[PDB]
Sequence to fold (1302 residues):
Amino acid sequence: PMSTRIAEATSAIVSKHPARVGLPPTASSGHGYQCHVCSAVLFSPLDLD
Amino acid sequence: SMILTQFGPFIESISGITDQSNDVFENAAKAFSMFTRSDVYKALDEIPFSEDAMLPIPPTIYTKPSHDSYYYIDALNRVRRKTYQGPDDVYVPNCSIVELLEPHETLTSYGRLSEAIENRAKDGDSQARIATTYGRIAESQARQIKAPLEKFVLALLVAEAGGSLYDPVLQKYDEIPGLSHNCPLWCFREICRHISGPLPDRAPYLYLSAGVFWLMSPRMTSAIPPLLSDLVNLAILQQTAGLDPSLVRLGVQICLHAAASSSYAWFILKTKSIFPQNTLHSMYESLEGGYCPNLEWLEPRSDYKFMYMGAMPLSTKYARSAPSNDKKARELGEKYGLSSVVSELRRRTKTYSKHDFTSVRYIRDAMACTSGIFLVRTPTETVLQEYTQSPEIKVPIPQKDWTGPIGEIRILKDTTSSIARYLYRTWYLAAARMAAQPRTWDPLFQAIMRSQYVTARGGSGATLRESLYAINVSLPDFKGLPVKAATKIFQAAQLANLPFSHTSVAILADTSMGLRNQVQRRPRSIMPLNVPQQQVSAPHTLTADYINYHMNLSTTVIPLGVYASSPPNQSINIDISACDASITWDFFLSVIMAAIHEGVASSSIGKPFMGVPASIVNDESVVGVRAARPISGMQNMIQHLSKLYKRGFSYRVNDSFSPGNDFTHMTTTFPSGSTATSTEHTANNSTMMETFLTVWGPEHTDDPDVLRLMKSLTIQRNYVCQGDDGLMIIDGNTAGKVNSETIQKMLELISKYGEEFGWKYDIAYDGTAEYLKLYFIFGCRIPNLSRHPIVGKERANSSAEEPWPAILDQIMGIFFNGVHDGLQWQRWIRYSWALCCAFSRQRTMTGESVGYLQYPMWSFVYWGLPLVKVFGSDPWIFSWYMPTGDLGMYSWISLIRPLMTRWMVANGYVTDKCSPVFGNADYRKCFNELKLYQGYYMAQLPRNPKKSGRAAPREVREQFTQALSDYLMQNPELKSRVLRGRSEWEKYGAGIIHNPPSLFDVPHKWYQGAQEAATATREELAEMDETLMRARKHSYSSFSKLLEAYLLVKWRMCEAREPSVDLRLPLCAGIDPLNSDPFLKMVSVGPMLQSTRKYFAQTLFMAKTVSGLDVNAIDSALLRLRTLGADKKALTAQLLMVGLQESEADALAGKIMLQDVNTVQLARVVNLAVPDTWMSLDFDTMFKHHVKLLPKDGRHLNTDIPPRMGWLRAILRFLGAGMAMTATGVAVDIYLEDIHGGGRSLGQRFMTWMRQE
Fold:
């Protein structure tokens, strides 16, 4: 149905997962997993890209 | 699979799979043309279907009686239809077409009528006349189609069989169903299979410019082409807009029951309010939430300037307090045997209670699933139906309340209990302070208004010249000139030397009938008037324009309806049925002429108007005595208009469809085509609503509720009207929605106001809003898709049609119509590719050679076709918001230029000259191999070129031009000003522009515009054909000078802009995350929130900005002279071509230099224009705030501009805006990467371009 189609459309475009619970951010658990040239950690969805 | 065999590569050339080369596009065009109708329907029979498309079809459509009992003959020898179900029952029936035909010579089973019927009809055989009327009206009903319908179906096939489509925003394939689910395709091919039967041909008719031919099976009905057109309409609009299959089954059920009826078009006219009434007019019974806009119509109540306050959550007190919709809708469903479809709609409309994208989408689907035919009937039936009506003036003015007459016009006593005193007072005061301003007394304004009624399909020039023959004057015939007999310019030219009292008789001639057709409405009939009565009808439209701009100042778009439908506010849609049959002399035009006679009478004593002298009449107005007082030129024109509107109008009637039925008769309807039409109608609506709200309200009610309402509801705050439609703005109070019962008491009182003195207010209180047929619910626009049908074209005349080089342009118009509404873009653009390539090749019949006329794709890409996947890029790479020209061309080429260069060094075309734009790669070999240049330059070739070309005699044209200039003059002071300016120009301004726009090229331009309706056939068409051929064979060097000047500019994008509106609000229907690209542009950029008539009128540099010669050329030439040196006296000479008075023209030419103009001004310098797609969006925001120079890297010394000639800043904003927006995704801000030459050298190149014209 159209209603579930619009629901999955909105959840595809906006409702991506990481809501960023407030940690002391650690080196071995970062959002930038490996910055593919420099090979480090960057913690942030706009930082790694 | 058959189209898969011929379109192995091409179907995924345009579905974002393989790269789009040119050669496969032309292979596709070869396979498109080399093709036939049996191949159409065997391709249709090839596909199966999946048990939701199928429905039973009754055989009662086909076996039909004869048309012998349907028509009869008038006592005055006119063929007229016999009615069966009401006086609306006058149309084409679907019956008995088989036996009125003679089979074609070189064809087998198709053909046209036998001619001996028309021999007997020209002899006067009655049944032969009935037969030829029926045959030619069926010919006309089948004439209404643009192209062969089969090619539209084949474009559907070649687009659709590519399958699912990936979305780069949603990273998914679509979930629309494919071919095997549509009731229109399966039912369409079922109809064609059964009608053709076992006969060897299959297509039930063929479209042809010479005329449609019919198939001879005995079961053939005449109204099968509009049924097939509705089938192919719904067939497109499913798979190009994402309709659900169920409502399409509903709509085709309506269409099949329509073709099964007595007559098709009558049932279509009476059925047209099922989809709105059961879905739109009953929606949101009990909601629970949602998000509505928050607007504010600001404090200047004529600004049309909106500050959008943001989103606002809904609540359950915003339920539908509009009254019930059970009774009349279920009676309509019962009346035509369609209770099932109404029961289904009233079922499913109840099931929605959330104002989101789904509900407004469903309303969009309901709006789309109605029919889209054009109602065609006999012209005599129109002019004997609607022009035979008189208004119902139940309370007329008593005869004791008028004075003794003054000339022909009695004057109202002011102690009159009738309502028309207030109308008298308004037009009186308006005429007084209209004649008080000296802006009416500019003789240049006189020349403007004399040139103003050179428009609007001027006709009856024949009847003008024989009435002028009857009143005994010598007459220049101007022998040997091509178009001129059918021109209004000849009407003006014959009376360029004539006294007014020698022409005052000649305003009594009759009036030609020009016909149009409408979507789901009766065929409107425009009419012109001849030039002396259009000339004498001036002060009427003077005071009408005064009311509409100063006094009530209501209007002459979109967020008007967004403000009106916003939930605490409430709207009332008010129309009139048949406005023009109401303005008669009985109640209106007597009072109108009296008040316009007396309002000027204080200021007018001895003033003469152009053309007309003074006079004198007597009066009984001082009833104890009688005297005679002199009459001024305003009052003279009103005295001449008085007998014309008092008398009634004579209308000639001549059709091409019934054999020789010519007649004139009296009709008391104000004409639809005049200068004084729409403005007067608006003024009358505004004044009647004012009289309502002033006196007639509290004079006729009881409770304090509705009067306490209407005290605070004046016309300066709450009413807008344009001709037919009017609109309430009911302000939501602090308690929210106004109580409904007061409003229903009020609207039945408005209906009383209509019935008691000759009106009929079609009042529609529904909780929603329409305005200029634009629907708005809770601040959300509904794109109606009925009123832009793809297939139909209005051809009310059987005159033969223009050949191939413009049907492609109407395909472009179909594309832009699909753009401006919320259509699924993955499946709209690819179908547009299908149509676009389907109308490429032509197969001429020129002498000695079989020529093939081929456009490349690149002409269309110049005209704004968004490329899918080019040079190995990503699919669906940029949007269709490209400006259709060099700007958008530049935008998408410079988005992908380094990827282009990598594709260039692939299949290596290398030459060591390091170009600044492509480096080591060349361009001249490949772009000619790809014929990028060929299509790119073919796009600027003029289409459908008709020319005079015959070398007419020069002396008779020269005296024609002199007579035209005599018509242009009334004061030789105009001539003095413009000849003085010509002297100044030949001193200074001449030379460096190569083309001055003037006012004496304007007779030459009027002749050139008059010579564009000769519809000559052979020679210039052959010249255009060889022009295309020699354009095709010619190999090219580089791009345009504009484009080469642009290609030095680079840019840089980063930081997508902050959001403009909340995405959780449904802004418009058909746009959402599912329709990702245009919705995301709407959210990122923001809607326009302006009327844009006001905003783009702020752009035009001249104040009144009208001359009759495209004032954009005036302002652009002025700014070109401004930037190209040119001391002030040359600027004054360019303005003295217009010749305002030379003192303020000298002042304006002094002003233009030092003032920094708007950004949009300098577009016209470089011949840039805002394309049509952008005015839904707010553009000025991202021009003056986001595209910018001095990038975030800093300053660069190549990103510099010299202090003189800072006109470049506007064009840098334009080009940066185009590059920022043509790509898909958020309209990211854009920063200036360097321009490779410096601003000095770059603007010097623009100087060298503007050295020529």
Summary: The helical segments of chain A are 2-13. The CA atoms of residues 37 and 48 of chain A lie 11 Å apart. The two ends of chain A are 36 Å apart (CA to CA).
